[PDB]
């Protein structure tokens, strides 16, 4: 597990090679989600991103598929695209086909581990969230049971 990281296309920041298939596995600790944001996108554009693409894949699901050349028009933020998953595992797959004649320079993305708010998103009386988990608390009369979930009088 890891709290943060970076994913760059092959040969970044220069042009990526052709006929290339690369994969990255993102893992953060339990109790954490993943926020993955792209700060650079320069990829050959095609319909449905069927030639060159970046696939963001969750468990047996496709979170996203990116191609083309985009950048932020916000002066206060360099983020082009972003994904926020409530899981501790993610996959990034970069695919490049036969020809890169136009010399596209690929992508640059970063991910960080976010905290799951288990109380907003589990306790009989009071849920207190903390970074990486939660605990349950009770009014001054009740006591916590052995399951650490339910409270009752003595």
């Amino acid at each position, epitope marked *: 597990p890891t709290m943060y990281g970076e994913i760059l296309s092959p040969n970044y920041p220069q042009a990526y090679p052709s006929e290339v298939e690369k994969s990255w596995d993102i893992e953060v600790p339990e109790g954490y989600g993943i926020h993955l944001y792209f700060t650079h996108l320069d990829i050959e554009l095609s319909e449905n991103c069927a030639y060159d693409s970046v696939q963001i894949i969750s468990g047996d699901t496709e979170e996203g598929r990116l191609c083309g*050349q*985009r950048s*932020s*028009n*916000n002066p206060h*933020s360099p*983020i082009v695209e972003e994904f926020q998953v409530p899981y501790n595992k993610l996959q990034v797959i970069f695919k490049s086909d036969f020809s890169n004649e136009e010399r596209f320079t690929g992508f640059a993305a970063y991910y960080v581990a976010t905290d799951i708010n288990e109380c907003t998103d589990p306790c009989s009386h009071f849920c207190n969230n903390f970074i990486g988990g939660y605990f349950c608390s009770c009014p001054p009369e009740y006591f916590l049971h052995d399951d650490m979930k339910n409270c009752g009088v003595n």
Partner: antibody
Amino acid sequence: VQLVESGGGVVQPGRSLRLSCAASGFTFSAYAMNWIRQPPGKGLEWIGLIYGSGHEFYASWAEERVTISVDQFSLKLSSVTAADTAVYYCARGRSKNYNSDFHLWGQGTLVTV
Amino acid sequence: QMTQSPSSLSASVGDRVTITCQAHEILHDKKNLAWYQQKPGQPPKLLIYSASILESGVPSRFSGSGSGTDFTLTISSLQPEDFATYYCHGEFSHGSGDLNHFGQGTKVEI
């Protein structure tokens, strides 16, 4: 996804103009959000935007007279003149930090002065 | 910022329509130009974005093209439902005027 606006009516000149818009099926914090207006018989005129991160930008003719807020998506226009009567639209951009197009529009509230 | 030509155009059903837009600056990402179609009493409908990409559900007669400053919308075959007003919309990089600007419009009549 859907956008619905409200607040359209008759307003005396010099008074205040406030319009509101509610989304349906998406959150306002993930897309760049725009106010546009169209005078009767005239063309479309971009008023302003707020990006998903939360930064508000305005047109040159409205940088001193307009405040755009997110909560909801509200537009506030002061010193309302007989030139401010128009159908006001709310629109959504393609991404968070750029527009590139408006694919999801509202319905448009007519405001008379 | 945006100059759309012509202001109006009259053509019969089945002819080709050309509408030009000039930005006088470089668009954001060099290609952030959208084309919309509006009918009376209705909001505008996005036809084209990124200066060439047709939106889902748009007939194939509509076409887009253009370089950094000059852009063109083409209707290869007019239809009874193609008579409306058309707008170009440009996104511009921060620090060069307004972020977004619409063209004057072009009303098409039989």
